[PDB]
Design a protein around this ligand. Structure first.
Ligand SMILES: NC(N)=NC1=[SH]CC(CSCC/C(N)=N/S(N)(=O)=O)=N1
Ligand SMILES: [Ca+2]
Ligand SMILES: [Cl-]
Length: 223
């Protein structure tokens, strides 16, 4: 997250870190035994880390649970990142508390102008590299469909939306992938892609989760 702020320990209790010996991706806990992340975050050897603030320090409140099953969207296209969404089922159920809580799925899509909270342990630099150990937060608006497709001609599908600032200086970045975009207490976005970070007319591109709620619920229910 470039141009955000320190969330505060456990102020985003649905934010998970995906870990394969290191934090590599964000995720969103949607019930005690299921995480939503980006398909492009897919790999073997995933440990889900809940209750995390500093990902380099055990502060108490952490739950480390291995993934039992990963399900990449059937239609995930790694070339275009169309349908950039993946479910992860935990070996055992998260103990739910004030620091480890689920985020509700959308009952409908969000519109441009809605303010959202984007969070993650990703890069905080537009130029160069700096990785925070503590969770960063960004308030950013959903941008117009039209604004989004003009920034990335030919690359935005109905399964993608832009959030942020065409002026730049505020954006998701490398390491934030699979993380939450929450608007009005609903998981509307997954940190998917973009061109650079916090560059002018290059807003963050997010997986449009409201397109996936029927697939998420059917898959959870059958798995
Ligand atoms: N871009 C952007 N807004 N979001 C995302 S998720 C990963 C990613 C950043 S590419 C890494 C670019 C860098 N290290 N600065 N795209
Ligand atoms: Ca920690
Ligand atoms: Cl916050």
């Amino acid at each position: 997250i470039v141009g955000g702020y320190t969330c505060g320990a456990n102020t985003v209790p649905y934010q998970v870190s995906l870990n394969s010996g290191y934090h590599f991706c964000g995720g969103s806990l949607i019930n005690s035994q299921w995480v939503v992340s980006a398909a492009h975050c897919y790999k073997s050897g995933i440990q889900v880390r809940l209750g995390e603030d500093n990902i380099n320090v055990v502060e108490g409140n952490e739950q480390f649970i291995s993934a039992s099953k990963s399900i990449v969207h059937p239609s995930y296209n790694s070339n275009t990142l169309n349908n950039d969404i993946m479910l992860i089922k935990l070996k055992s159920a998260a103990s739910l508390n004030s620091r480890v809580a689920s985020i509700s799925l959308p009952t409908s899509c969000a519109s441009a102008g809605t303010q959202c909270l984007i969070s993650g342990w990703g890069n905080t630099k537009s130029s160069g590299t700096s990785y925070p150990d503590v969770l960063k937060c960004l308030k950013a608006p959903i941008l117009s469909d039209s604004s989004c497709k003009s920034a990335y001609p030919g690359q935005i599908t109905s399964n993608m939306f832009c959030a942020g600032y065409l002026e730049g200086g505020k954006d998701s970045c490398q390491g934030d992938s699979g993380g939450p975009v929450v608007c009005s207490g609903k998981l509307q976005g997954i940190v998917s892609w973009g061109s650079g970070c916090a560059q002018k007319n290059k807003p963050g591109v997010y997986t449009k989760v409201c397109n996936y709620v029927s697939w998420i619920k059917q898959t959870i229910a059958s798995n």
